Amino acid sequence: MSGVEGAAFQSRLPHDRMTSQEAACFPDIISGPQQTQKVFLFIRNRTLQLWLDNPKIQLTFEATLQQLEAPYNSDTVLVHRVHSYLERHGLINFGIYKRIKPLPTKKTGKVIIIGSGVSGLAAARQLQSFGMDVTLLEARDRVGGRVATFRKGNYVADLGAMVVTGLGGNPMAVVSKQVNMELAKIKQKCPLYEANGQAVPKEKDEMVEQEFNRLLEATSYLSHQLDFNVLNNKPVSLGQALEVVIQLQEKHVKDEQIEHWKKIVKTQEELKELLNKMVNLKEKIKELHQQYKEADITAEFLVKSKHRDLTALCKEYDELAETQGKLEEKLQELEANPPSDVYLSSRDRQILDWHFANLEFANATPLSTLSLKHWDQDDDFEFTGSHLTVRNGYSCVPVALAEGLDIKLNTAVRQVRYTASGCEVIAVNTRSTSQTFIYKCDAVLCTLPLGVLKQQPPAVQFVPPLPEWKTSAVQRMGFGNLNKVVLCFDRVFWDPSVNLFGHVGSTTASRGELFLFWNLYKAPILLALVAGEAAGIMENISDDVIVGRCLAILKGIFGSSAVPQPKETVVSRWRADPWARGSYSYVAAGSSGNDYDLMAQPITPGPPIPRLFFAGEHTIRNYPATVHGALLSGLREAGRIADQFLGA
Ligand SMILES: Cc1cc2nc3c(=O)[nH]c(=O)nc-3n(C[C@H](O)[C@H](O)[C@H](O)COP(=O)(O)OP(=O)(O)OC[C@H]3O[C@@H](n4cnc5c(N)ncnc54)[C@H](O)[C@@H]3O)c2cc1C
Ligand SMILES: O=CCCc1cc(F)cc(F)c1OCc1ccccc1
């Protein structure tokens, strides 16, 4: 594919037609001749290409006009329109870049942003570029939110986001170039170790995995082909459907076991009756063998008759022992080819629970909480390319984003007042909570995590309270959990050529406890994941004991002598973290992707213009629970807000 077509793809745009969004802002193009539309698209793609080819400097209108070839560089008005649209919507001149045109010194409109994670920072930089007065209020003593990098000595380790999900179409590709993230592709191989330390043999790792795929497709067939979505008044969870399809495979195994037993018994009865019938014939021949020995002309003919009759019963017998053979032959082969005894052996199921845990990792919640119909509604939006880890720590992104922003750390928002005339945010200093702050403004952008919005009683009071249609969405939606244990050693004792290895838990309930180990970093560091039901429960374990359990697993895989005591350790507790209350959102049973749209919807105080805006990973339907989705949501909101307070 070409250069300009690649730029559309990298911007998540169809290279050869206009989006609905573009059709709204450029109606004259839609109703116009086909030729002009083709010219529009080329101007849009080429502008994106100029920006994506060098995202480190601002791409100005003037510079765009100068790098277009004829006849495109001659339609100055259209070029400005396109450049302005792309800039407003954050498709060019986003992230951190050298400004050509320095910042307008008289600001226009005052926006408070709640929260200094990627969504807040991304919006903030936009709004600051559009010439507004932006202040962020962050409760932690750092920026980044759920991007949190641990650094001590040579050790670098991410406690929140750590993976970049393909660069094709990914806005983080731009930010990576801007910020100089060291990215590294993740090697796919992931050996598993049973709870006793033994490696899972390849036959089984392969067999179980393929059966995990088949099981999971069956739940999709149930949902998206049989409408198995609402059972006895309740929406079906993924975990529930998974139980169903396992139960049928178990039924299928039991039934072919029954058919086999029936085939055995039938052949045994045949042999039992045939042998008895052969028994009676030996007796019948016993009595004729006796008459033949006793034996005149009627005697001379008596012998021929007795011989003719004695050998006829031997033909009957020899012919039955022939059938005797082809039965006990058919029997012997059936006693040797039993079908499966059980669908899953005890070890097989434990290994299968690993794959389930891996999916509870990806979604941050136990499977029995996920919406069967919608849990993967975002799959059509995945980026192309291999996944990467941030070898220098993902915190480099929000820290770069924070440069030059008016960011008030240790400032926790307690109440958001919004009315038709303006807004007031009330916050306390987390170091001296008697100290209070009152921030007047024209608009509030709320990037508070869904976990904080769900908090009952509320951590942040809204005045007037949020409308029912918004609170209903917040209650319906899922906010999951996921935790990491960071182990820093003075020497690498694991396989260096492997990024991942799995610990197969002993029980289904605990299947997510320390189930996946990551080797990601220059220094000798391991990350152990705690997923599913284990995530929330493990937060109540002291660090010394949970690390002891890691070392117990690792000493089982590598030997008790090869595993030294760690020099430094860190354990996340995202659920108990008051500024997150969880890891990220998931589509809960009974929710749907539509709730992500309602989360993004701004609030207008009744009689009118909107004042309270929403960004964050829980507000972007096609990219939830990700860093880039948070980034995209901040860009989106900055465009929405600038449209309102500067003009569309
Ligand atoms: C353990 C873990 C692993 C993850 N794995 C990945 C991964 O590899 N890749 C990926 O793309 N995503 C992953 N994610 C998800 C990703 O980190 C998030 O989607 C993303 O960080 C969303 O950030 P946000 O800006 O929307 O919210 P946040 O980063 O939470 O920002 C909200 C901010 O508001 C602040 N705040 C809270 N309450 C208040 C208050 N009262 N007043 C003021 N400020 C307040 C918070 O401190 C925070 O800074 C993971 C997340 C976690 C936690
Ligand atoms: O550590 C953080 C993982 C959380 C996460 C949340 C998402 F919504 C999407 C992700 F890509 C993702 O991170 C990498 C990943 C990819 C596939 C399966 C599991 C994890």
Numbering used by the authors: 171 to 465, 473 to 784, 792 to 832
Task: Tell me, in the authors' exact words, what the paper reports.
It is a flavin adenine dinucleotide (FAD)-dependent histone demethylase responsible for removing mono (me1)- and dimethyl (me2) groups from histone H3 lysine 4 (H3K4) and lysine 9 (H3K9) residues. LSD1 functions in transcriptional repression as a component of the CoREST (co-repressor for element-1-silencing transcription factor) complex and the NuRD (nucleosome remodeling and histone deacetylation) complex by demethylating H3K4me1/me2. Via its modulation of gene expression programs, LSD1 is an essential regulator of stem cell differentiation in both embryonic and adult cells.
We previously developed an N-alkylated trans-2-phenylcyclopropylamine (2-PCPA)-based inhibitor, S2157, in reference to the 2-PCPA-based cell-permeable LSD1 inhibitor, S2101. In this study, we downsized the N-alkyl group of S2157 to synthesize a compound named S2172 and investigated its efficacy as an LSD1 inhibitor. S2172 exhibited stronger LSD1 inhibitory activity than S2157 (Ki value of 0.27 ± 0.06 vs. 0.37 ± 0.08 µM), while the other three enzymes were not inhibited. S2172 had a kinact/Ki value of 9800 ± 570 M−1 s−1, which was better than the reported value of 7800 M−1 s−1 for S2157. To analyze the mechanism of inhibition, we next solved the crystal structure of LSD1 in complex with S2172. In the crystal resolved at 2.62 Å, S2172 formed a covalently linked adduct with FAD in the catalytic center of LSD1, through a cyclopropyl carbon atom. The overall structure of the LSD1–S2172 adduct was similar to that of LSD1–S2101 or LSD1–S2157, suggesting that S2172 can inactivate LSD1 by a mechanism similar to those inhibitors. The adduct of S2172−FAD and nearby residues of LSD1 are colored magenta and orange, respectively. S2172 exhibits efficient brain penetration and a reduced inhibitory constant (Ki) compared to both S2101 and S2157. Thirty minutes after a single injection of 30 mg/kg via the intraperitoneal route, S2172 reached a brain concentration of 1.52 ± 0.14 µM and a maximum plasma concentration of 0.75 ± 0.09 µM at 0.5 h, indicating a good brain-to-plasma concentration ratio (2.06 ± 0.39).
